[PDB]
């Protein structure tokens, strides 16, 4: 059977902050931007490791997120609604109120990946937008 798993978007951070699937699991997966304020703002979702920052030379207390070196999914064919295969550089940006749903079977990606977005130059980042998703093998 296909899992349903829903991700919540709110400024800054995701609900929930931390999921697992197993390597073969069959995931529908919601990202759903349930952004709080007025007005709602854009946010994105990216699966990936190890995260990239900016760099000018000069030491930084929080260093300022811009992506991820390894997308999660990378080859992993999606269906999403009438739409069938791989996206290249995958990653789901939503306005406010806006939902998007996709299903997959997990790809053999096992260990520590994680989530976030690199929206308004990493402050979304800063303020918590950053989650973890375990990938355990095949039960
Ligand atoms: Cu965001």
Same mark, same amino acid.
């Given at each position: 059977?296909?899992?349903?798993?829903?991700?919540?978007?709110?400024?800054?951070?995701?609900?929930? $902050? *931390?999921?697992?699937?197993?390597? +073969?699991?069959?995931?529908?997966?919601?990202?759903?931007? *349930?952004?709080?304020?007025?007005?709602?703002? #854009?946010?994105?979702?990216? %699966? +990936?490791?190890?995260?990239?920052?900016? &760099?000018?030379?000069?030491?930084?207390?929080? #260093?300022? #997120?811009?992506?991820?070196? &390894?997308?999660?999914? &990378? =080859?992993?064919? %999606?269906?999403?609604?009438?739409?069938?295969?791989?996206?290249?550089?995958?990653?789901?940006?939503?306005?406010?109120?806006?939902?998007?749903?996709?299903?997959?079977?997990?790809?053999?990606?096992? =260990?520590?990946?994680?989530? +976030?977005?690199?929206?308004?130059?990493?402050?979304?980042?800063?303020?918590? #937008?950053? +989650? %973890?998703? $375990?990938?355990?093998?095949?039960?």
């Amino acid at each position: 059977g296909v899992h349903h798993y829903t991700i919540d978007e709110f400024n800054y951070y995701y609900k929930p $902050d *931390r999921m697992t699937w197993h390597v +073969g699991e069959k995931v529908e997966l919601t990202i759903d931007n *349930r952004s709080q304020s007025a007005p709602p703002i #854009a946010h994105q979702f990216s %699966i +990936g490791r190890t995260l990239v920052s900016r &760099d000018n030379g000069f030491p930084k207390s929080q #260093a300022i #997120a811009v992506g991820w070196k &390894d997308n999660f999914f &990378d =080859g992993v064919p %999606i269906t999403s609604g009438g739409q069938t295969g791989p996206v290249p550089a995958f990653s789901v940006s939503l306005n406010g109120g806006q939902k998007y749903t996709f299903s997959f079977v997990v790809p053999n990606k096992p =260990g520590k990946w994680e989530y +976030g977005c690199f929206l308004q130059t990493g402050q979304h980042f800063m303020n918590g #937008a950053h +989650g %973890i998703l $375990d990938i355990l093998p095949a039960q």
